[PDB]
């Protein structure tokens, strides 16, 4: 069986360095191309880099030009990238593959996350997003709680203490460009609840042992 | 560079086909085409390579062709385990991979999305801050495009879109955000979030003095 280990991942902060290493066994390692391939968290492949059976020609995607060299140890079935200057762009998980031929890359091993932040720990700001004033007047209304600028993940998110859970729904998080994550959480409830019904999200950030309980109100306007 | 349609569907049992467009450098001079099927939180798995051969151990059910500067996958009698997004790769393409596809194997009825569209809270404004939030929710299948427009024109810088994923009702949900300063978001007379599901779009408009 071809297999294929990546090790290296990590946290990163922007213009640093990382090496990513990969263990392969199963095929004669020293007889095939080898590259490297990406994946920006919820986005498509992005090819890195290859490297000829005996390491004689390396190539880079024009992002990582000149930035990553990639490197093997055909005597120690390894494959190597060295990612310089990164930047948050750079965050992926970064896959370690075997390229049959005209990058082609028939085994993949299960990828390294790199995330690329200056950020330290850092609880989140909690945004209210009030109703609509116009799902206002009747039948139901969204409403819902923005949380900014956390680092590292995760957050969760309750409603009401927990006593709020239908129809609520707690979205993944985006790496902003700033280096700090964001999500949003959403409820949907009755318009006749908006003036007696006190709406509150309970946003827990463990890794800085901040809690925010942030009351949704419908708007003045 | 090598452009597939953003999502495709069948139920169990019927077939699809998911094309593969790119130029006549790489498709057309080419016959190092790829597929590859991802599951979520899995790694890509190699389904075709080199226009139509299959690894050992892929169904035959899964077959590729090339006609010009387009490859297509097919899967033929699809099984609830293909839903999966699928990217062709080729030789010659400068990032190799094409934008991706996502497949669904129907379960459930068609379900149009319903828009919610933020305008930047008073509270955020007055941190200095401005996030429009794009929430798109209760759809099926879980794939959508979204764009967004201020005054009208696309807008592009600033964007951070979700990946589709399930509500506990099992329908869809994504999430976009527009990051403005308060400056550029008093700027414009008018924001949208446009989405775009099976093909059709619902756009959602709000505009700084608007009471949204
Ligand atoms: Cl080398
Ligand atoms: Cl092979
Ligand atoms: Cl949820
Ligand atoms: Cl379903
Ligand atoms: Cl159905
Ligand atoms: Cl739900
Ligand atoms: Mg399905």
């Known amino acids: 069986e071809v297999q294929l280990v990546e090790s290296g991942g990590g946290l990163v902060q922007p213009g640093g360095s990382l090496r990513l290493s990969c263990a392969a066994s199963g095929f004669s390692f020293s007889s095939y191309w080898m590259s490297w391939a990406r994946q920006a968290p919820g986005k498509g492949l992005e090819w890195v880099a290859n490297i000829k059976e005996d390491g004689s020609e390396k190539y880079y995607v024009d992002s990582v030009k000149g930035r990553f060299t990639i490197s093997r140890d055909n005597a120690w079935n390894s494959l190597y990238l060295q990612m310089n200057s990164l930047r948050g762009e750079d965050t992926a998980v970064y896959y370690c593959?075997?390229?049959?031929?005209?990058?082609?890359?028939?085994?993949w091993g299960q990828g390294t996350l790199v995330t690329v932040s200056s950020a330290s720990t850092k609880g989140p700001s909690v945004f209210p997003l009030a109703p609509s004033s116009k799902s206002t007047s009747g039948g139901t209304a969204a409403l819902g709680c923005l949380v900014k600028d956390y680092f590292p993940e995760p957050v969760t998110v309750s409603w009401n203490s927990g006593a709020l859970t239908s129809g609520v729904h707690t979205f993944p998080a985006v790496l902003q460009s700033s280096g700090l994550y964001s999500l949003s959480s959403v409820v949907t409830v009755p318009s006749s609840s908006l003036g007696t019904q006190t709406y509150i999200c309970n946003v827990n950030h463990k890794p800085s042992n901040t809690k925010v309980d942030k009351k949704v109100e419908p708007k003045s306007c | 560079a090598l452009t597939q349609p953003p999502s495709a569907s069948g139920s169990p049992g019927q077939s699809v086909t998911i094309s593969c467009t790119g130029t006549?450098?790489?498709?057309?001079?080419?016959?190092?085409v790829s597929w590859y099927q991802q599951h979520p939180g899995k790694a890509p798995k190699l389904m075709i390579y080199?226009?139509?051969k299959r690894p050992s151990g892929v169904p035959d059910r899964f077959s590729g062709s090339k006609s010009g500067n387009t490859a297509s996958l097919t899967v033929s009698g699809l099984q609830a385990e293909d839903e999966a997004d699928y990217y062709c790769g080729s030789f010659a393409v400068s990032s190799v991979f094409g934008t991706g596809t996502k497949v669904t194997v129907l379960g459930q009825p068609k379900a149009n999305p319903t828009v919610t569209l933020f305008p930047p809270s008073s509270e955020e404004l007055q941190a200095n801050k401005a996030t429009l939030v794009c929430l798109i929710s209760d759809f099926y299948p879980g794939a959508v495009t979204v764009a967004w427009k201020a005054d009208g024109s696309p807008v592009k810088a600033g964007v951070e879109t979700t990946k589709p994923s399930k509500q506990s009702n099992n329908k869809y949900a994504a999430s976009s955000y527009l990051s403005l300063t308060p400056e550029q978001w008093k700027s414009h007379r008018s924001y949208s979030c446009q989405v775009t599901h099976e093909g059709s779009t619902v756009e959602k408009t709000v505009a700084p003095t608007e009471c949204s």
């Open positions: 080199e226009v139509n």
């Open positions: 006549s450098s790489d498709v057309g001079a080419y016959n190092y």
């Open positions: 593959t075997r390229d049959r031929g005209w990058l082609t890359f028939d085994y």
